[PDB]
C-alpha cells in the first residue's frame, strides 16, 4: 500500500531519501534546502516558506496579506533544528493519520501516482521534456559548501513550512510563460506551505458550541484535515485538471459588502458540501468540458509521443503505459489509445466530487465548519501534536477512551481546553473597514461581519445561447456528487502501473514565474452616516474601562454617551434593569430582571397566525435595523406587508436570460432521424428549465441566503450583547454593597448566568427557524416565478417551433404527423417542479426546504388584505388587486359589493405560480355575511342566482353564486362540462345562525372530490371525477352579477386561495384562528360596540326576550312575536322585539373582563340593571331602576367569555366589586312560581359558575346572551 518513512531531522543527507533540493522557485540560483522524502514522489521541507516574500513580512504589521483572515505572524516558528525536527515528525504523524483510513490512503495513493506529463503545452506532441521547472527538480550532490554537482529527480509534491502568515496554508502550483501544466491536463509539481499546530477555529450558528455565552465557543480544527484538504488542491493540480472558469466575485459596490478574493469552482470542489451548489450546472458542464479538452490533447500525444530529448534514460513505452494508467486511457489491439467516456466521467467525478473536505470529515469523523463561506474565528495553537493523550492516529483529537468522542467533544474550545492555548492578539492582524459619519465618529468593522454578496457577473449567461438540435443530440447532467462509498471499494481506480524511477538528467532551463507578494492596508475607512446592522450592534457594547453604565432605547443616546448602552428589549425591561435598590432586596430584583432578560428574549417565539405567519421575532428590527430600516415602526406589521424581502441588506439582481432558441434539423424520407430531433429538443427542453433552477439556486445561496447568514450571527451577537450588558450592571451594583452586605445577599452567578444563557439558546433556535424561514420564502416567491416566466415564454416559442417542423415534414412524418403534434403539445404542457435536493444534498438546506413546505401557510397564493383604505395581495407572490369605487372597506377586513356598476374588484393572478400541477389541488376560504330576503321578495330571493366572484379563463375556470338561502362551487373543465357542490341554511327556523350572520366558508378540490366547510365542519361534498383539464389563473373578478335586485349586497372577509387541498384539521383551524378577538361581538358577528343600541337574545332561551313588567321593576320573558305575513316559504321571529338596550363603560369597542353598566331605554329615561346582593337564595329576578346609587344592590358588570371555542355569544357576571374575585352571580333567565303558568324572570344565578367550568362548554345554557342591532341585513 503506502508507506510513509522515518527519519530525523538530523539524519545525514544520501541523496536518495534525504537530499539537499534546489526548489523551483529558487530558479536554482544560491542556497539549497534539506528536504526528506515521507513518500514516493511527495517531500518535506521543514523550514519558511519564504518565495515570494520580504524577510520583514514575517513580522507582525499593519498590513495584511489576505483580507478575509484573521492573520498569525510569528518569525520565529521553525528557527531551530529542533523545531524543525518536530516539524517532521509532526508531518509524518499526520501522514499516519491520513492513511488508517482506507479512503485517505487512497487519496495519497492517486497523488504518488498522478505523476506529471513529462512536458507543457509547449511542448511538440512527439516529445517528452522533462527539462522543465514543472516535472524535474534539483538535488545537490556535490560536497558541502559547493555545487559541483546537481542531478534531477521527478517529484509530485513538495510540502514546505508556513509563509509569514502561519494559519493561511496553501497549494501552489507551477507555471512558466504564463500557463499552467497543472490546469492544462499535464500536472506539475505542486508545492504547499503548511503549518500544523495553529488551525483554524469554527462554529455553527444554528448548532451551539456546547452552548455558553460565557465560556470558549466554536470548535478547533484537525490538522490531518485540513492538510487533506490541501492534498485534494494537490491531487487536482497533478491531474492537470484545476482548470480556471468563471469564478464568484463578490459585490463590492456598497460599503456594506464583503471585499475578497475572486473564487473559483475548483475551491467550491474542493471543499464539497453545498458550496458546489454556488457553482451553476451551466459551468460545472464549461469546466467538465474544458478538462475533458484537456485530456484529449494528452492522449494525442501519447499516441504520439516517440522521443526524450532532455532524458535519454526515459523510457518511453515505460512513461505512455504510465500516464495511460495515470488519466484512464483505453488501449485497442493496436497500440492506439483513446478515452473512454465512462471511464472519465467516474474518474472526474471522483477526483471533483468524491475527494472533499466535506466527504473525508463526515468518513473520519472529524468536525468541519458548515461552509466556505461561514465566519473566520481566531486561530490556536494546539500544545502538542505529539502527546497521544491528546492526538491519536486513529482518532484526533475525538478520543473515545477521553469520552472525547461523542459529538466532537474533542474538537469543542469550551471542552478540551487542555488541547491548545489562545493566541496573542497582538501577533494577530485582521482587515477592518473603519465607517466614519461624516459630522464624525468611526467604527472599525471586521471584514468577516460584512454581506458577501455574489456579483451578478459571477453566473453563466449561457443559457441565452442557441441549440442546435439533431437526432443525435443528448441530454448533459453533471452530478455534484459522488458515492463515498464505492469510491473507496472501487478497485480498478488504484494506480496499476509502477512508479518509474524518480532519477533523471539535471534540470538546467529554469524558466518559471514566481508569484510576487506584498502586503495591503490592514484598514481601509469609508464614509457613511447610514446606521445600519454594523452601527447597531455597536451601540450595545461599551469600552472595557466604563464600570457605570444603563439601558437605554435610544440608539442615537447610546452612541454618543460610553455608559449608555442601547437594547432593544422593552421599556419596562430597560427600567427595571436600571433600578437601584437596598442590599435587601438585591436577590428580588436580580430574580427580577433576569427572568425578565428571559421572557423578553423568549419573545422570540411570538405567533401571527391571524396574519397568516406562524412565527415572528418582533425585535430583530430594533436589535439590528438591517434591511429597509426596520427599526423604525412596527416590525411584524411591516413584514406582514413586505415579508423576507425587507430584511435583506441588499436586493439582488438576478440573471434570468431568455433561453435561447432550438434549431431543429430535417432528416428527409427519414421518419426516425426527424422524430428523434423531436424526442430530443423534448429532453433538452427538461434539460433547460432543470439548469434554469440550479442557476437560480446558486445565486440564491451567494446573494441571499448569505445576507441571511449575516443576520443571524449579528441577532447572536446582539443577544449577549445584551446579556453582557445585564452581567455589567448586576455585577456593579452589588460590588457597591460592603462585604457585609454582600454576605447576606443570596446571589448565585452561575445560576444567574445559566438562566441567561438557556434563555438565548432559546431564541437563537427560533430567531434562526424564522430567519431560515424567510430565506426560502425569498427564494420560493421573488426568486423561483422569474425564472418561471422565461421558462413559459420558451416552453412557447419552442411549441410553435416543434409544430412548424413538424408541419414541414408532413409529407416525411405521414401517418404520425397529428400523432407528435399533440406530443409536443402535450409534453410542453406540464411544468417541471421545482426541488431543491436536486441542486445540493445538504442535510440542513434540505430541512429548510422541507420544513417551509410542511407549513400549510405557504401554499397561500392569494391573501386579500386590508391596508391603508385599499385591499392588496399578501401572499407574497404580488398578485395584481384593481378595487373599483362601489366597494366599501373598513379597517376590520370587510368589504361589501353593491348592485352597483362598479363595486367590483380585479384580481389578476401571478402566472408563475405552479397551481394545475394537473390533478386539480387547491382550496379557497373567507367569510360572508349574507342578508336575509325582503319579506316582499323572497319568490326573486328563492329562484334567481347571481354569480359573486367569478374566475375563468378562454370559458374554463370557477365560480361562486348564490341562490338565495343557497351559496354554490362550479367548476368548468377546459370542455364545457359542469359540476357543483352547495351549502343552503334553512329559511323557516325560529333563529338562523347563518342569515346575515358572518360565517365561514372554505372549499377544497383534490382529484376527485370538491368539498364545502361551514365553521370548519363539513356540511357537502361532490364527486368531480369526470371534470377534465380546469383553467383556474384567470382573473378573478368580485362582483354581484346576475338577475340582482338594486338592493342586494354581500359583505365578505379574508379572502384567500392555496394551491392544495386543505385538511379538515387545516380547516377547523384556520376558523378558530380567523375567529378571534379580543372584543366580543354581537348577533350578527361584527365588533360589540359600547353606547350602541341593542336588543338581547339568549342563546338558551331563543324566542324568549325581555320587556319591562308594567308593574314593577323587573324583567319578564314575553315570547318573541313572529312572521305575521303569509308566505309559507319563509318564518322567523321577530329579533327588532323586547327592551332597548345599551352598553356602558365603568372606567368604542366592548373588550373581555372589561367593567360596564348594562343600561336600556324606557320612553325617555335611560335605567340600569342591578342585583339584591344578599338573596341567600340561588337565583332571583334582577332590580331595572333608574340611575340611582341604590346601595342596596348592585350595579357594575364585568362581561366575560368563557366559550374557548367560536361564538357570538358573551356571559354578563356581577361582582361585590372590581377586586374581590368573591363573585355574585351570573345573568340569566330562570322560571319561579305564580298561580292563581308561573313566570320565568331576568334571574341572576349562582347555579351557572360550576357550569360555565364544564366541558365542553354548554352552549344552550341561559347565561349565554347575545346583542343584536338593527342591521339592514335583517328587515321584519
Ligand atoms: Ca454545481
Ligand atoms: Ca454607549
Ligand atoms: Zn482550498
Not at 1111 to 1130: A, F, M
Request: hydrophobic share 35%.
Amino acid at each position: 500500500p503506502v508507506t510513509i518513512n522515518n527519519f530525523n531531522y538530523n539524519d545525514p543527507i544520501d541523496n536518495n531519501n534525504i537530499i539537499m533540493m534546489e526548489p523551483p522557485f529558487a530558479r536554482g540560483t544560491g542556497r539549497y534546502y534539506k528536504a526528506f522524502k515521507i513518500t514516493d514522489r511527495i517531500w518535506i521541507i521543514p523550514e519558511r516558506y519564504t518565495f515570494g516574500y520580504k524577510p520583514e513580512d514575517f513580522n507582525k504589521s499593519s498590513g495584511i496579506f489576505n483580507r478575509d483572515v484573521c492573520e498569525y505572524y510569528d518569525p520565529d516558528y521553525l528557527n531551530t533544528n529542533d523545531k524543525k525536527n518536530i516539524f517532521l515528525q509532526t508531518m509524518i504523524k499526520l501522514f499516519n493519520r491520513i492513511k488508517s483510513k482506507p479512503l485517505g490512503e487512497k487519496l495519497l495513493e492517486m497523488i504518488i501516482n498522478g505523476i506529471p506529463y513529462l512536458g507543457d503545452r509547449r511542448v511538440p506532441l512527439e516529445e517528452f521534456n522533462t527539462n522543465i521547472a514543472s516535472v524535474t527538480v534539483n538535488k545537490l550532490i556535490s560536497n558541502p559548501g559547493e555545487v559541483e554537482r546537481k542531478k534531477g529527480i521527478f517529484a509530485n509534491l513538495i510540502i514546505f513550512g508556513p509563509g509569514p502568515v502561519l494559519n493561511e496554508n496553501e497549494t501552489i502550483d507551477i507555471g512558466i510563460q504564463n500557463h499552467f501544466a497543472s490546469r492544462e491536463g499535464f500536472g506539475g509539481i505542486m508545492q504547499m506551505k503548511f503549518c500544523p499546530e495553529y488551525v483554524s477555529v469554527f462554529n455553527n450558528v444554528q448548532e451551539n458550541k456546547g452552548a455558553s455565552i460565557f465560556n470558549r465557543r466554536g470548535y478547533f480544527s484537525d490538522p490531518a484535515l485540513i492538510l487533506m484538504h490541501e492534498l485534494i488542491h494537490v491531487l487536482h493540480g497533478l491531474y492537470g485538471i484545476k482548470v480556471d472558469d468563471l469564478p464568484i466575485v463578490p459585490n463590492e459596490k456598497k460599503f456594506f459588502m464583503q471585499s475578497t478574493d475572486a473564487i473559483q469552482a475548483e475551491e467550491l470542489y474542493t471543499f464539497g458540501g453545498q458550496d458546489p451548489s454556488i457553482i451553476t450546472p451551466s459551468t460545472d458542464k464549461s469546466i467538465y468540458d474544458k478538462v475533458l479538452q484537456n485530456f484529449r490533447g494528452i492522449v494525442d500525444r501519447l499516441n504520439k509521443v516517440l522521443v526524450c530529448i532532455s532524458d535519454p534514460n526515459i523510457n518511453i513505452n515505460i512513461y505512455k503505459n504510465k500516464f495511460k494508467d495515470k488519466y484512464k486511457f483505453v488501449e485497442d489491439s493496436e497500440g492506439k489509445y483513446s478515452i473512454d467516456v465512462e471511464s472519465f466521467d467516474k474518474l472526474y467525478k471522483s477526483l471533483m466530487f468524491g475527494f472533499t473536505e466535506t466527504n473525508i470529515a463526515e468518513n473520519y469523523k472529524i468536525k468541519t465548519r458548515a461552509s466556505y463561506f461561514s465566519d473566520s474565528l481566531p486561530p490556536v495553537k494546539i500544545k502538542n501534536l505529539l502527546d497521544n493523550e491528546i492526538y491519536t492516529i486513529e482518532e484526533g483529537f475525538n478520543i473515545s477512551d477521553k469520552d472525547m468522542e461523542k459529538e466532537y467533544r474533542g474538537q469543542n474550545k469550551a471542552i478540551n481546553k487542555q488541547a491548545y492555548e489562545e493566541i496573542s492578539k497582538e501577533h494577530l492582524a485582521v482587515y477592518k473597514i473603519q465607517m466614519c459619519k461624516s459630522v464624525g465618529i468611526c467604527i472599525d468593522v471586521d471584514n468577516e461581519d460584512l454581506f458577501f454578496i455574489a456579483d451578478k457577473n459571477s453566473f453563466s449567461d449561457d443559457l441565452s445561447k442557441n441549440e442546435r438540435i439533431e437526432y443525435n443530440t443528448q441530454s448533459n447532467y453533471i452530478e455534484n456528487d459522488f458515492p463515498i462509498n464505492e469510491l473507496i471499494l472501487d478497485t480498478d481506480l488504484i494506480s496499476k502501473i509502477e512508479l518509474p524511477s524518480e532519477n533523471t538528467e539535471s534540470l538546467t532551463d529554469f524558466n518559471v514565474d514566481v508569484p510576487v507578494y506584498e502586503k495591503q492596508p490592514a484598514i481601509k475607512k469609508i464614509f457613511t452616516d447610514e446606521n445600519t446592522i454594523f452601527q447597531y450592534l455597536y451601540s450595545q457594547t461599551f469600552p472595557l474601562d466604563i464600570r457605570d453604565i444603563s439601558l437605554t432605547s435610544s440608539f442615537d443616546d447610546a452612541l454618543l454617551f460610553s455608559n449608555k448602552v442601547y437594547s432593544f428589549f422593552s421599556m419596562d425591561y430597560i427600567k427595571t434593569a436600571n433600578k437601584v435598590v437596598e442590599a435587601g432586596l438585591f436577590a428580588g430584583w436580580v430574580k427580577q430582571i433576569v427572568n425578565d432578560f428571559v421572557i423578553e428574549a423568549n419573545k422570540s417565539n411570538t405567533m401571527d397566525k391571524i396574519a397568516d405567519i406562524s412565527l415572528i421575532v418582533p425585535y430583530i428590527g430594533l436589535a439590528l435595523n438591517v434591511g429597509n430600516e426596520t427599526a423604525k415602526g412596527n416590525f411584524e406589521n411591516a413584514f406582514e406587508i413586505a415579508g423576507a424581502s425587507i430584511l435583506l441588506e441588499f436586493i439582488p439582481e438576478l440573471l434570468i436570460p431568455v433561453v435561447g432558441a432550438f434549431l431543429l434539423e430535417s432528416y428527409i424520407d427519414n421518419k426516425n432521424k426527424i422524430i428523434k430531433t423531436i424526442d430530443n429538443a423534448l429532453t433538452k427542453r427538461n434539460e433547460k428549465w432543470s439548469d434554469m433552477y440550479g442557476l437560480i439556486v446558486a445565486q440564491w445561496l451567494s446573494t441571499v441566503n448569505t445576507q441571511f447568514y449575516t443576520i443571524k450571527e449579528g441577532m447572536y451577537k446582539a443577544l449577549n450583547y445584551q446579556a453582557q450588558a445585564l452581567e455589567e450592571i448586576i455585577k456593579y451594583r452589588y460590588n457597591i454593597y460592603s462585604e457585609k452586605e454582600k454576605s447576606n445577599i443570596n446571589i448565585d452567578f452561575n445560576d444567574i448566568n445559566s438562566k441567561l444563557n438557556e434563555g438565548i439558546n432559546q431564541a437563537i433556535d427560533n430567531i434562526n427557524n424564522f430567519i431560515n424561514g424567510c430565506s426560502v420564502s425569498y427564494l420560493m416567491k421573488k426568486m423561483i416565478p422569474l425564472a418561471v416566466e422565461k421558462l413559459l415564454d420558451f416552453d412557447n416559442t419552442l411549441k410553435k417551433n416543434l409544430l412548424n417542423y413538424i408541419d414541414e415534414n408532413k409529407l416525411y412524418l405521414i401517418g404520425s404527423a397529428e400523432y407528435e403534434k399533440s406530443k409536443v403539445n402535450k409534453y410542453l404542457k406540464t411544468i417541471m417542479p421545482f426541488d431543491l435536493s436536486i441542486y445540493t444534498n445538504d442535510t440542513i438546506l434540505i430541512e429548510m426546504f422541507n420544513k417551509y413546505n410542511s407549513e400549510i401557510l405557504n401554499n397561500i397564493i392569494l391573501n386579500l388584505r386590508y391596508k391603508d383604505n385599499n385591499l392588496i395581495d399578501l401572499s407574497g407572490y404580488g398578485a395584481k388587486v384593481e378595487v373599483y369605487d362601489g366597494v366599501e372597506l373598513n379597517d376590520k377586513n370587510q368589504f361589501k359589493l353593491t348592485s352597483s356598476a362598479n363595486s367590483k374588484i380585479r384580481v389578476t393572478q401571478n402566472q408563475n405560480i405552479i397551481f394545475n400541477s394537473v390533478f386539480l389541488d387547491f382550496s379557497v376560504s373567507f367569510w360572508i355575511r349574507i342578508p336575509k330576503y325582503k319579506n316582499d321578495g323572497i319568490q326573486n330571493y328563492i329562484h334567481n342566482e347571481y354569480t359573486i366572484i367569478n374566475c375563468m379563463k378562454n370559458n374554463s375556470g370557477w365560480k361562486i353564486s348564490i341562490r338565495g338561502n343557497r351559496i354554490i362551487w362550479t367548476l368548468i373543465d377546459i370542455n364545457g362540462k359542469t359540476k357543483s357542490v352547495f351549502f343552503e341554511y334553512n329559511i323557516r327556523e325560529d333563529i338562523s345562525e347563518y342569515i346575515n350572520r358572518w360565517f365561514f366558508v372554505t372549499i377544497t378540490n383534490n382529484l376527485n372530490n370538491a368539498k364545502i366547510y361551514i365553521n370548519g365542519k363539513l356540511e357537502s361534498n361532490t364527486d368531480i371525477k369526470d371534470i377534465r383539464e380546469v383553467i383556474a389563473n384567470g382573473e378573478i373578478i368580485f362582483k354581484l352579477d346576475g338577475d340582482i335586485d338594486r338592493t342586494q349586497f354581500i359583505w365578505m372577509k379574508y379572502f384567500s386561495i392555496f394551491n392544495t387541498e386543505l385538511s379538515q384539521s387545516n380547516i377547523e383551524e384556520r376558523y378558530k384562528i380567523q375567529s378571534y378577538s379580543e372584543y366580543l361581538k354581537d348577533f350578527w358577528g361584527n365588533p360589540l360596540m359600547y353606547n350602541k343600541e341593542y336588543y338581547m337574545f339568549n342563546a338558551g332561551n331563543k324566542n324568549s326576550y325581555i320587556k319591562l313588567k308594567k308593574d314593577s321593576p323587573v324583567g319578564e320573558i314575553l315570547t318573541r312575536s313572529k312572521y305575521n305575513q303569509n308566505s309559507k316559504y319563509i318564518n322567523y321571529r321577530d329579533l327588532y322585539i323586547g327592551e332597548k338596550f345599551i352598553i356602558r363603560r365603568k372606567s368604542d369597542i366592548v373588550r373581555k373582563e372589561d367593567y360596564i353598566y348594562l343600561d336600556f331605554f324606557n320612553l325617555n329615561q335611560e335605567w340600569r340593571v342591578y342585583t339584591y346582593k344578599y338573596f341567600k337564595k340561588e337565583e332571583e329576578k334582577l332590580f331595572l331602576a333608574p340611575i340611582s346609587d341604590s346601595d342596596e344592590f348592585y350595579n357594575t358588570i364585568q362581561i366575560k367569555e368563557y366559550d374557548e371555542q367560536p361564538t357570538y355569544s358573551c356571559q354578563l357576571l356581577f361582582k361585590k366589586d372590581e377586586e374581590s374575585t368573591d363573585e355574585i352571580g351570573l345573568i340569566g333567565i330562570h322560571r319561579f312560581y305564580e298561580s292563581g303558568e308561573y313566570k320565568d324572570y331576568f334571574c341572576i344565578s349562582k347555579w351557572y359558575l360550576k357550569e360555565v367550568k364544564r366541558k365542553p362548554y354548554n352552549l344552550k345554557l341561559g347565561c349565554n346572551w347575545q346583542f343584536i342591532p338593527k342591521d339592514e341585513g335583517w328587515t321584519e
